[PDB]
Amino acid sequence: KNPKSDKFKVKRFHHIEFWCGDATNVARRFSWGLGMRFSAKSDLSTGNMVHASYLLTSGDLRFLFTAPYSPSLSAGEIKPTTTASIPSFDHGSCRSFFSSHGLGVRAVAIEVEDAESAFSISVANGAIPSSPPIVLNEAVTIAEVKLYGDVVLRYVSYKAEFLPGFERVEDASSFPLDYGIRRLDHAVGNVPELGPALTYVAGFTGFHQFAEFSGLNSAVLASNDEMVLLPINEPVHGTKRKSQIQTYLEHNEGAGLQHLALMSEDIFRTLREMRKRSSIGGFDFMPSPPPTYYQNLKKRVGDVLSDDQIKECEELGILVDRDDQGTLLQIFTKPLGDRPTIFIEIIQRVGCMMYQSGGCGGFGKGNFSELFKSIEEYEK
Amino acid sequence: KNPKSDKFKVKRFHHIEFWCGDATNVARRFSWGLGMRFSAKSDLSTGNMVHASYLLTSGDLRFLFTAPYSPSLSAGEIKPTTTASIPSFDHGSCRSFFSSHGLGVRAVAIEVEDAESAFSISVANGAIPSSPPIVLNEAVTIAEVKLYGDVVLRYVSYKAEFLPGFERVEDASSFPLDYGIRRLDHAVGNVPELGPALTYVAGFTGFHQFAEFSGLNSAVLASNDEMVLLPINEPVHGTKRKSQIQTYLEHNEGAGLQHLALMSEDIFRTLREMRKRSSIGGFDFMPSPPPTYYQNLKKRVGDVLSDDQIKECEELGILVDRDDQGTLLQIFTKPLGDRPTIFIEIIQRVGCMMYQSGGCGGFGKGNFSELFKSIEEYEK
Ligand SMILES: CC(C)=CC[C@@H](O)C1=CC(=O)c2c(O)ccc(O)c2C1=O
Ligand SMILES: CC(C)=CC[C@@H](O)C1=CC(=O)c2c(O)ccc(O)c2C1=O
Ligand SMILES: [Co+2]
Ligand SMILES: [Co+2]
Fold first, then answer.
1. Which ligand is closest to the CA of B319, given by its number?
2. Which family does it belong to (chains A, B)?
3. Do residue B194 and residue B162 come from a single domain?
4. Of A28, A31, A280, the CB nearest to B175
5. How is chain B split among helix, strand and coil, in percent rounded to 5?
6. Which domain covers residue A323, as residue numbers?
């Protein structure tokens, strides 16, 4: 049941902004590890005396990495005279954000038809304002509201290249890395209480609940066409194994973004490329499910995947689950930084062709059962 | 003239510790970019609730990358009950250090015969104490005094693997990267006034001035055998081109470590390996000197280098200068992080065989002249 209750025209995921201690080093690590190209910069060399911001792109996926310079560099400036290309930036907020959470996502950015109206409607509908709409060079408008914890949902809209004040990067500094990742599929938040979080965000967006088929309860909010997907988790206390959501909240000092799901146009090549680089600067992956998990795969998705594609799944450690609508291939990295907080998920969806509809195959919740009922190989 | 006036037995450079926002991401970047192996860890997985510390090694070169966790994780601990493996660590100092300077070197560590006595003698001789001697597990003793700005000179001594509480890293997480770098040759500080800095450090170490053959004045302090080498620079104001030392001091918020000189056992393979990786996560190098600089190289070092080695120097952008004692091959990276502050120098020394004596060939001061008198190619 899709009631199509968006309160403003929401287009697509536009970018994800990390707040870092040092943007250069995180961005270069992510570039190698994920296969993303250096696309745009705003820093000292572009006149920005306030922050360093570097953009990586892969297909439609945009990762923005931002860190503050010394406040002294911009001591004479005021907000009207700022050289920051992202006027919502604030040294005190960024240092407090990073000191409090460590490396993680500050902004989940979505493109809307009119950022000023989306901000006005949102706040009128319960959104906590974070940064009011600002018009960059008569061309781009950006506005921010609180999402959960210190994460903001950022609205961007264009009259008609990333943002004004960013420069395209000279191509000799821009090596065309690509491991197949093409767009952001969904972005997941962890909160201490799901209900009030759901009520708040659904409240000011009009996003509807997306239908689903140990440790947490979750739910998914979605825009009209279900291209913007925002799952949210809460912990379930009192279990046998401690909730990883609870571990997240402890180490992150509260609510925040748990993981980013990146859609690959060929998940097998992406995982081959990423695994080759795990131990030489890239990302590590969670431990692989046992071979019994893969001995049981022929029976539920042998429909969709050949024996060859199934055996390739076992090599790369890929997990597979299925909706009534499509099939989902997924895998999870280990945490991206020091803290056991943010990680990345690689995914590819098969089915639901109309273009492909969002959430096709769901989010893998069928894999808790498939996984637990596979650790019965410890008796095999 | 070497008066051999060390006030305590100084052995060798032991390690360099960076204070980071996120140790994981800086360490993985440095590992790929420089060819260093993941060797030791102290973090949550080893019981350290206070900081994450990762060690990279290449030959004798040890780079330590440290970042604080949330203070909350260790709120119940006191210094006697600390889980930090480096008891000099302090959340407030590290966050203040990093917020103030950004990514850079916190500790220049040298191995001494007795860290407690070296600390006592130092302070008795004018050193500002930073962290008093602590004995780690009846085996290792560590003590810290102020060097310049917020950089500490760290004394370590062993009764008889890096430090207690560090774990060796499982070899599947430890890929044997190596591009030829073998040890730290010297570590360079920038200060607003050279004289008082020189007086202070020579004061409590007994290190002597090392004899030399636009923008700055400098001098070099050295231990008895001249294996520990500590150049220090100050700016010269009023020039035509602004002092880069002054630019350093502005962006670093004051004095600090300018660059690390890493000795390669084969600088041509190191630079080939590093340049291949510049645009895919590694380090960038300063612009190459003009071909006229290389057309003039046959006349001064054609003695030491073949036409082939000279043409290889032009390919890799290597600079070459010469003492009366030896020949020095060097090159400089661009800044390692967001700020135009810390960078790295790659070097290899030829000559002064006795083992090779320290500073053989000097530090390249002859290249200001060779470089300026080469930009007369803009008229060629
Ligand atoms: C293996 C790991 C570090 C975390 C997995 C787990 O926390 C998780 C990931 C996820 O992606 C997801 C959804 O996408 C949707 C519902 C839902 O319960 C979940 C999840 O539980
Ligand atoms: C190209 C660049 C970013 C910086 C070069 C310059 O700042 C420099 C480097 C250096 O290594 C050095 C010595 O090793 C010794 C004396 C001395 O004056 C110097 C230097 O001036
Ligand atoms: Co997911
Ligand atoms: Co040098």
1. 2
2. Belongs to the 4HPPD family.
3. no
4. A280
5. 30, 35, 40
6. 179-380
